C-alpha cells in the first residue's frame, strides 16, 4: 500500500495512451480495436459467449454490438485520464463494479485472463512503452473492478 501505482508512472501512461488518439476521426479505431478484445476473449473461455446474448455478439460487424465496443474503451479511457486526483477514481470505478454486479454469470477469474490478453495485446499497437508502468496501473483498474463479485 501507498507505494504501488506511484505518481510519476501514470504520467507516462497518459502520454503513451494519448498517441493513438492524436489522429482525428478515431471512432473507427476504437470500434475495431474494441471489436478484437471481446472476440479474442471468447476463443479462450467459451463460457462467457452466453453473457453477450443481449447485445447480439453473433454479429461481429453488427451495429447493435459495435456500439457496445465503444462504451467499453471509452469507459476505460475516462479511467486512465482520471488516474491523477485518486479520490475521484475510486468513486469512478466503484460505479463500474456495481454496474457489473447486477449482471449474473460474471466470474472473477475472467478478468485475470482479460488482463493477460491486454497486457500482451497492447505491445503490438504502440510505438514505445514501459511494460512495468502499464503493469502497475492495469492491476489498479482491473483488481478494483470485480471487488463487488
Amino acid at each position: 500500500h501507498e507505494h504501488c501505482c506511484s505518481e510519476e508512472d501514470h504520467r507516462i501512461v497518459q502520454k503513451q495512451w494519448d498517441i493513438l488518439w492524436r489522429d482525428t476521426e478515431s471512432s473507427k479505431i476504437k470500434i475495431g480495436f474494441g471489436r478484437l478484445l471481446l472476440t479474442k476473449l471468447a476463443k479462450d473461455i467459451p463460457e462467457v459467449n452466453d453473457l453477450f446474448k443481449r447485445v447480439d455478439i453473433e454479429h461481429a460487424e453488427g451495429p447493435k454490438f459495435s456500439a457496445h465496443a465503444l462504451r467499453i474503451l471509452n469507459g476505460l479511457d475516462l479511467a486512465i485520464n482520471l488516474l491523477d486526483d485518486p479520490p475521484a477514481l475510486d468513486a469512478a470505478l466503484d460505479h463500474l463494479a456495481h454496474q457489473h454486479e447486477v449482471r449474473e454469470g460474471v466470474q472473477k477469474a475472467h478478468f485475470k485472463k482479460f488482463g493477460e490478453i491486454l497486457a500482451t495485446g497492447l505491445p503490438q499497437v504502440l510505438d514505445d512503452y514501459d511494460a512495468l508502468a502499464w503493469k502497475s496501473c492495469l492491476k489498479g483498474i482491473l483488481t478494483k473492478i470485480s471487488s463487488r463479485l
Binding site: 506511484s6 505518481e7 485518486p86
Partner: peptide, 9 residues
C-alpha cells in the same frame, strides 16, 4: 502542492 512521488491531497 505535490507533483512528484508520495501522491496525496
Amino acid at each position: 502542492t505535490w507533483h512528484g512521488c508520495l501522491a496525496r491531497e
